[PDB]
């Protein structure tokens, strides 16, 4: 069972700054990494798939990068609406798994 680690668990940033969340897999997963956003009392929302691919409807300030075991989800110009929990999930090997999650904080 792949283990995705998201540290730090909490992230503090100033309005407008560039922020980055880390996800690291216990083994090489290529690019099979996907990000989700979850605000207070909401359901998860796909933000990035296959480490860097964009989704229709997601603000152009969201990007992703990485391969193997190190992945990064970035946000250029952190706003209000970004306050939320971020999770990463892999599809490389069965069963799919989820990161511990990271809370954004302005």
């Amino acid at each position: 069972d792949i283990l995705l680690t998201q540290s730090p668990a909490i992230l503090s940033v100033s309005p407008g700054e560039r922020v980055s969340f880390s996800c690291r897999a216990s083994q090489s997963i290529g690019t099979d990494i996907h990000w989700y956003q979850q605000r207070t009392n909401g359901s998860p929302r796909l933000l990035i798939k296959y480490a860097s691919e964009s989704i229709s409807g997601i603000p152009s300030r969201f990007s992703g990068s990485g391969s193997g075991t190190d992945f990064t989800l970035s946000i250029n110009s952190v706003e209000s609406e970004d306050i939320a929990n971020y999770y990463c999930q892999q599809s490389n090997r069965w069963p799919f798994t989820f990161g511990s999650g990271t809370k954004l904080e302005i």
């Binding site: 069972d1 599809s91 490389n92 090997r93 069965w94 069963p95």
Partner: protein, 103 residues
Amino acid sequence: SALHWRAAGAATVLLVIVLLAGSYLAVLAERGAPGAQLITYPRALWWSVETATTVGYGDLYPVTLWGRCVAVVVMVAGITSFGLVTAALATWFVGREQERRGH
């Protein structure tokens, strides 16, 4: 029309069918198996072609009894097809030669 040309092409529709069904059955059989990698259709399709052509790069392969059973069928379809064309190109070169000589 020419038999050898019927089966050759026919084996090409069949192979494609086995190639698609292969991808589907592969995922179905491999999911549920810890550590399995043949778990999404797209790559599972690339795995099929790989198998059918016996190129086997080793980047993806089945680990369950059924995935493997599925693999044996794809391999055999690939091999039978690629060999039914060769046997066809032979019946063709033999026919043309047989006329460029007298018969």
